[PDB]
């Protein structure tokens, strides 16, 4: 079962340096674990702005998670998560950049709490969205609302904690889930 998966990862300064390193390590671990041909990966850093660090076609040409993320420059600015999700939905899931028409679209949004910006993510509604939290401010009442909004429904199945989520033996079968 094919899956095109985008890591949308938070490069803003609210994260502690070690927390951002854990995000990098998490993405690389998942790509290393879920390495079979059915999976393709892209990664987009967001802060004030959004940068595709690598697309699906880069992933296929290299398939070396360490080399693909080698040159990521830490943005360390604000947290425009809404604009970021919209960016992925419209600018990353493209046949142009190596997306597969038959593949299930999955987004792993890795972040530490609420966004600087607001709006809607209607354009991403056909995408299966997981929210992977890190940090001491990730689940408060300040952010509860935003995280529910970003996650696929039921949110209780899609809002995760990086620390516990990364240990799942059946992680690759979990991200392939399509009935929910």
């Amino acid at each position, epitope marked *: 079962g094919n899956v095109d998966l985008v890591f949308l990862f938070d490069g803003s300064m*609210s994260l502690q340096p070690d927390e951002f390193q854990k995000i990098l390590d998490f993405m690389k671990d998942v790509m290393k674990k879920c390495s079979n041909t059915s999976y393709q990966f892209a990664a987009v850093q967001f802060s004030t702005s959004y940068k595709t660090e690598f697309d699906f076609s880069d992933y296929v040409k290299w398939k070396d998670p360490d080399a693909l993320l080698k040159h990521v420059k*830490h943005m360390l600015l604000l947290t425009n998560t809404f604009g970021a999700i919209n960016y992925v939905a419209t600018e990353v899931f493209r046949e142009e950049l190596g997306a597969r028409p038959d593949a299930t679209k999955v987004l792993i949004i890795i972040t530490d709490g609420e966004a600087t910006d607001s709006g809607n993510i209607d354009a991403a509604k056909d995408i299966i969205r997981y929210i992977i939290g890190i940090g001491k*401010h990730f689940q408060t009442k300040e952010s509860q609302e935003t995280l529910h909004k970003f996650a696929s429904k039921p949110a209780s199945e899609f809002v995760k904690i990086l620390d516990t989520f990364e240990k799942l033996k059946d992680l690759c079968t979990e991200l392939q889930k399509k009935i929910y």
Partner: antibody, heavy 120, light 106 residues
Framework: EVQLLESGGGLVQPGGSLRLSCAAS???????VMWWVRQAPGKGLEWVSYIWPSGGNTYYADSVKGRFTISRDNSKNTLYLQMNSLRAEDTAVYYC?????????????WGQGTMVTVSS | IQMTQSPSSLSASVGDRVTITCRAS??????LNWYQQKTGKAPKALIY???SLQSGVPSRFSGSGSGTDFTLTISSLQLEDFATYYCQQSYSTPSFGQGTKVEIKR
């Protein structure tokens, strides 16, 4: 525009107490870690305290621990500093400031400052 | 984390290019910020994240560096730029460099 306005500064005898206030306007105060940062005359900037958005968790520089208390009223968008047992070394300009990106360790907005003088 | 700023003070003519350095006691990646403080005024952010100029700040200001060594540049010093400049690491809880006092040479 966004601003922070301090008030409450003045002359206090050593051992006395004083309360500073900082009114926020133009931004969503309740989302931000808030700080007090002070500057003694002709010296550098020293953070003395900060408080999480909800106002539960509080933190203090060792120079002020046990003597100062930070608090906030998100309903009035106001930040407070209760200074007790004041020493000569606490004489400084006191600024409030917000965390850049809600809770980074960079400073976003600064108040105008309020002078505190501790002298008998 | 100790931030060593350099020099402590400098004198330069209007239109001159000005360079201020800041060294950290450990690698702090890009968690390095610059503030300007004029007399009897609060600090004001010029640069976040080593190189990111903040809106409103004149484009003559620029920041560079990562790891341990950082630089604030004023491409053409103006009368307005008379002030004290501080670097500030945001890697852990804030610490500041000692400051650099810029005077106008005439």
């Amino acid at each position: 525009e966004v601003q922070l306005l301090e008030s409450g500064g003045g002359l206090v005898q050593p051992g006395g107490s004083l309360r500073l206030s900082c009114a926020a306007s133009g931004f969503t105060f309740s989302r931000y870690v808030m700080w007090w940062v002070r500057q003694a005359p002709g010296k550098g900037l020293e953070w003395v305290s900060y408080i999480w958005p909800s106002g539960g968790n509080t933190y203090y520089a060792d120079s002020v621990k046990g003597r100062f208390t930070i608090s906030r009223d998100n309903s009035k968008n106001t930040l407070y500093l209760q200074m007790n047992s004041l020493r000569a070394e606490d004489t400084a300009v006191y600024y409030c400031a917000s965390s850049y990106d809600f809770w980074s360790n960079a400073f976003d907005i600064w108040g105008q400052g309020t002078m505190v003088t501790v002298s008998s | 984390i100790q931030m060593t700023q350099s020099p402590s003070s400098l004198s330069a003519s209007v239109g001159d290019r000005v360079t201020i350095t800041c060294r950290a006691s450990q690698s702090i990646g890009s968690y390095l910020n610059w503030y300007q403080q004029k007399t009897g005024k609060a600090p004001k952010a010029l640069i976040y994240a080593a190189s990111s100029l903040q809106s409103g700040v004149p484009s003559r200001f620029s920041g560079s560096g990562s790891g341990t060594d950082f630089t604030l540049t004023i491409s053409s010093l103006q009368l307005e730029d008379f002030a004290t400049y501080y670097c500030q690491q945001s890697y852990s809880t804030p610490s500041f460099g000692q400051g650099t006092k810029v005077e106008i040479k005439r």
